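Why do we bother with holo predictions? Because pocket geometry can differ from the apo form. Keep that in mind while you read this record for SN-glycerol-3-phosphate.
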Amino acid sequence: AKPQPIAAANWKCNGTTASIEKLVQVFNEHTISHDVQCVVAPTFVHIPLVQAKLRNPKYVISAQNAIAKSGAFTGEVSMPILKDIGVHWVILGHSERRTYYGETDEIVAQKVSEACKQGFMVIACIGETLQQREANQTAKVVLSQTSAIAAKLTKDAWNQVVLAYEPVWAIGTGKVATPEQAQEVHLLLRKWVSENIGTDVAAKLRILYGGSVNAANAATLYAKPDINGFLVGGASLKPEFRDIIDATR
Amino acid sequence: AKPQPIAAANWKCNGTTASIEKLVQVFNEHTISHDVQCVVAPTFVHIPLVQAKLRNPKYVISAQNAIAKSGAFTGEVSMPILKDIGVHWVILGHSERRTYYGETDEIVAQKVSEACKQGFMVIACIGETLQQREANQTAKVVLSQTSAIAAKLTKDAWNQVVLAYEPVWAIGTGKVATPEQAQEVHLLLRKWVSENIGTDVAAKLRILYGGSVNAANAATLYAKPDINGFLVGGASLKPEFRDIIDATR
Ligand SMILES: *C[C@@H](O)COP(=O)(O)O
Ligand SMILES: *C[C@@H](O)COP(=O)(O)O
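The structure, written out:
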């Protein structure tokens, strides 16, 4: 009775046209035989290449970030611009944007709200730091991040939201969360959604895990009842993303 | 004895594929009969479209921003990625990135240095605020911004630099700097470069003006001896950019 899983590739700031062409061919040649939404999020400048080359019908293309409106915002890409070029998925609130690039809960929440209004599917990232984990604040943090986002959404908007629980200490560090750690958080998130948003919304909501997912640990994560797939960084640059997808069977 | 002028279009966060196709056709059909480097800086996601459609031999394509290195920087585009896709011009330090997106003098200077090391032509933006202007700090500000950049450059690197003097109060406000205001600043910048970098470097350096340039005011700006062309925002989205280019004759 889980909702449809998602296997999402966050390529981050990586790729050449040669490397992308090779990896997209790998993705194309991998026949997927279960119901899963695959997502690839290239850098902005690589979106047209991926749109030209990616043909696997289980995939959609996502942006890694956006701003809400067009205008005098040198260097940024807006949601209307993405929609016009055919991109209607976006990752918002990823941790280094929160950490490095000043995206507060309020800024993330506003972005998510705008994206939903413009018809995007949104992968909204939440997660605690190592300091917060060791201070026994994990629940408080992820619920605060989630409630900030929720405050700007209507109930219907949640049909467009995907949460990605990504402990900051697991991102790129080779220190994956255990299945029990991840399940604990996904369960408490889903219960919050059930009680604060709706029981229907909670049952349908995809809550993905991210942070050092690889092809060897993914199936055991996916076996937990409240884990609906993955947001994958480093391993999504490699052919083993195929087995991460198949770990959602 | 001016160096080769530049007419640069900063499209900012604007465009659809239909609007871009139409404007690029206008640019293509405009025959330019003098020595000028034209530059168009689309949003990242529009770079491939512009590369596919733009054919006027006086043009090159620029990014509106970049980060120095590839890696775990969700949402950002790096200098190596741009180089690989054929983009070897970049605008750095534009005012709302300084104001809105936390680019300090140190961050701008580091970006400019990295870009030069990677073989980019760089349009490095400097300029004072209205508050700084009214406090009689214009010179101090633009020289501080310039010297910060200079501190991370070798002499040879300056062959890749273009300065864009853009008073913040003139950006998008319909309040262009007068020719005398702009010339005063360009003269003091060039003298600083001459004395601190080299007399040869100063003679060859393009110092562009930006901030509410349009087709009607451009020629009178260009007539000033230390103005080498323009960084154009709003008017570069319109067919009248053709006459801004021709104002550098
Ligand atoms: C969610 C994403 O940032 C995790 O990156 P990994 O390299 O998969 O840890
Ligand atoms: C340099 C650039 O920001 C100026 O924009 P305008 O719209 O031309 O004032």
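The pocket of SN-glycerol-3-phosphate (ligand 2) is lined by residues B 10, 166, 171-172, 210-213, 231-235 (CB under 6 Å).
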